[PDB]
DNA sequence: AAAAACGTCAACATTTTATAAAAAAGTCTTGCAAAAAGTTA
DNA sequence: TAACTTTTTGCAAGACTTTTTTATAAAATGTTGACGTTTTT
């Protein structure tokens, strides 16, 4: 896959990947991968403000900020893994609920492309 | 306990009570009790509209809207029960967290001690 | 040894970001007049 | 309860402050088609 300019319209096959150790996001372009890795920390700051003006809760909404940021940056789709398995949007959001009870936040990082095994395994 | 005018600065011993069968909110004055019962269904719209601008999610945040609203209406304190037991502010939220994954919303209604 | 097939890479076509400026929605005072609560005897 | 005083409430008119739009240039991504090479015969 991967067009002449470097875009993967079929996320599963991408080589642009990011993972926070729990969740893995695939992107269609390096442009998006870096857009995501470069500004997610900022996005979290700005995310928490907006939300605090709507409600005050004992929760760490960072992961939720990360999915929203992901969704806003990847214009060509949505494909993610949750600890190795194929994860849907709702499934990543469930993880985000369970994890917002935790005070600290895992950071993100680029990681090499999975590998046919890990891929067939995730489904 | 109750002022002459009928205000309970000690919500723990108030007769102005609203409940949704799962949790129960104690008000300090019938006025606040009704400001709540009369304005919550509308707050849920306003609330989800507001939250929806920050992020779209598969969740039903009404209860969180409910807890938030309670906090802004009851100006003389915060007291609540969760399935019979006294509930800290954090425990009511934990609960609001669970019901987030439930499609329908419990409605509120006045009750008596 | 070519003709057909490929693969690379300018050069021009389109689609997407990035922003600055403007518009518009939404918030946060300030000021009483009114309703609620506190006091008073 | 009644009568009076002091707080909260409700709203309206401005002054501000984010969000949403627009518009437009910049930056990406997409396409096309000579031009050398490769591989098929």
From Swiss-Prot, chain B:
<keyword id="KW-0238">DNA-binding</keyword>
<dbReference type="Pfam" id="PF05464">
    <property type="entry name" value="Phi-29_GP4"/>
</dbReference>
<dbReference type="InterPro" id="IPR008771">
    <property type="entry name" value="Phi-29_GP4"/>
</dbReference>
<dbReference type="GO" id="GO:0006355">
    <property type="term" value="P:regulation of DNA-templated transcription"/>
</dbReference>
<keyword id="KW-0731">Sigma factor</keyword>
<keyword id="KW-0010">Activator</keyword>
<keyword id="KW-0244">Early protein</keyword>
<keyword id="KW-0805">Transcription regulation</keyword>
<comment type="similarity">
    <text>Belongs to the phi29likevirus late genes activator p4 family.</text>
</comment>
<keyword id="KW-0678">Repressor</keyword>
<keyword id="KW-0804">Transcription</keyword>
<feature type="DNA-binding region" description="H-T-H motif">
    <location>
        <begin position="76"/>
        <end position="95"/>
    </location>
</feature>
<dbReference type="InterPro" id="IPR038246">
    <property type="entry name" value="Phi-29-like_sf"/>
</dbReference>
<comment type="function">
    <text>Mediates, together with protein p6, the early to late transcriptional switch by stabilizing the binding of host RNA polymerase (RNAP) to the late A3 promoter. Activates transcription from the late A3 promoter and represses the main early promoters A2b and A2c by modifying the topology of the sequences encompassing early promoters A2c and A2b and late promoter A3 in a hairpin. Proteins p6 and p4 bind cooperatively to an approximately 200 bp DNA region located between the late A3 and the early A2c promoters.</text>
</comment>
<protein>
    <recommendedName>
        <fullName>Late genes activator p4</fullName>
    </recommendedName>
</protein>
<comment type="subunit">
    <text>Interacts with host RNA polymerase (via C-terminus). Interacts with DNA; binds to the A2b, A2c and A3 promoters. Interacts (via C-terminus) with the histone-like protein p6.</text>
</comment>
<dbReference type="GO" id="GO:0003677">
    <property type="term" value="F:DNA binding"/>
</dbReference>
<dbReference type="GO" id="GO:0003899">
    <property type="term" value="F:DNA-directed RNA polymerase activity"/>
</dbReference>
<dbReference type="GO" id="GO:0016987">
    <property type="term" value="F:sigma factor activity"/>
</dbReference>
């Amino acid at each position: 896959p991967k067009t002449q300019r470097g875009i993967y319209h079929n996320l599963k096959e991408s080589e642009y990947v990011a993972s926070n150790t729990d969740v893995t996001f695939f992107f269609s372009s390096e442009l998006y991968l870096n857009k995501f890795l470069d500004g997610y920390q900022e996005y979290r700051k700005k995310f928490n403000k907006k939300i605090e003006r709507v409600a005050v809760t004992p929760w760490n909404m960072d992961m939720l900020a990360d999915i929203t940021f992901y969704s806003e940056v990847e214009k060509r789709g949505f494909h993610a893994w949750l600890k190795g398995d194929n994860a849907t949007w709702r499934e990543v959001h469930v993880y985000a609920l369970r994890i917002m009870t935790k005070p600290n936040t895992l950071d993100w990082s680029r990681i090499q492309k999975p590998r046919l095994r890990e891929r067939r395994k995730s489904m």
